[model samples]
Target: GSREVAAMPAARRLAKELGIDASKVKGTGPGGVITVEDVKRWAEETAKATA
Candidate 1:
């Protein structure tokens, strides 16, 4: 009785799309489940760190 999209939050879905584990991502970017902003900042900073 719902949209399939609702089964996954946006950021977690994005993590999958990037082929990474959402669980391994720290959510101290937090207060609740990682929203797209948190995941985005984490991913970008990680890229910055390695690049």
Candidate 2:
């Protein structure tokens, strides 16, 4: 359980750790900080690139 659970937090934590501009994120979380949902949503939108 711990191993599978670990990856999500790690991915979520990257918003802060990687210096992502959370302000640019249309915050889906409280207080305007980037949440995992925001990251996933952004990723999905970005993945549509043809180039």
Candidate 3:
């Protein structure tokens, strides 16, 4: 029911639960590689606000 980003299962789950966005955020992992933590953080922000 929502967009999906290159992320881990756990992070994806958390994002779903937290109502976080998935198509966002300049990932902080490696060369802007999407990470669970980064996605989750931005997702949370999307819930509250947006990038």
Candidate 4:
């Protein structure tokens, strides 16, 4: 399976938890895999909205 496929569920969950649109992020990992770093960056940015 592509890393993107494997990362999908976790990525979606992170997006939900952070209340951000997951589609905005551009994946750079193998096969467009969204790494944990990518999600963390999104989460941090999303946190700014609530601050």
lDDT of each: 0.61, 0.54, 0.61, 0.65
Q: Write the per-residue lDDT of candidate 3 for residues 1-51, one digit (tens) a residue.
A: 624335566655766777766445555554344678777667766667644
Candidate 1 stretches greater than 4 Å from native: 1-8, 28-31
TM-score of 4: 0.55
TM-score, structure 2 vs. true: 0.44
- For residue 28, model 3's alpha carbon misses the true position, in angstroms, by 5.5
lDDT value for model 3: 0.61
lDDT per residue for candidate 1 within 19-50, as digits (tens), equals: 65566665443344666776777777777895
Looking at model 2, which ten-residue stretch has the lowest summed lDDT? 1-10
Model 1 lDDT, full chain set: 0.61
TM-score, every prediction: 0.58, 0.44, 0.47, 0.55
Give lDDT tens digits, candidate 4, residues 1-51.
Answer: 433443466776776777766656765556676666777786787666864
How many backbone clashes are present in model 3?
Answer: 0
What clash count goes with each model? Answer: 0, 0, 0, 0
lDDT: the better of candidates 1 and 4: 4
**How are the candidates ranked when ordered by lDDT, highest leading?**
4, 1, 3, 2
Candidate 4 ranges beyond 4 A from true positions: 1-7, 46-51
Residue 35 lDDT in candidate 1: 66
Please report how far candidate 2 places residue 37 from its true position, in Å. Answer: 0.9
